Amino acid sequence: SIKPLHDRVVVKPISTKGEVVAIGAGKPLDNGSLHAPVVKVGDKVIYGQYAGSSYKSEGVEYKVLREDDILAVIG
Template sequence: MGLRPLGDKVVVKPSEEEEKTPGGILLPDTAKKKPQEGKVVAVGNGRILENGEIKPMSVKVGDTVLYAKYGGTEVTIDGQDYVLLDEDQVFAIIEG
């Protein structure tokens, strides 16, 4: 991937959207929910504090995370969709 985030930015590959309802009805693109879960594919170096120190990132490449539903910037690189988020738009790491 040719995308390297700066500072406290995180690049997430969103999970696939639901194609069917639990009852088996196929959903058109306009009815699909916007994903809020994805896998971290790149992280920046961390936030630069006022004293010049760099605060390390809380997430790392490979983490599965929950993020703000309408947060971040959507980008497409080589036909693949990604979301570029500030670290504080990542709410949780899914463990297990």
């Protein structure tokens, strides 16, 4: 259900690994555009074990991170 904003990313856990489950539209820029995200739904990612905020849904725990919390796309 959760819809991330700006450059927020929702990750399902699976430093810790996890998959990208939702992505924001993009951080707004001064100059009137959005910074396009550099991750996509489906990406497996690594992030700091305690980066961002948790939020549970249907008993699944998710993380809402800033893109800057994401170290690396793994595949």
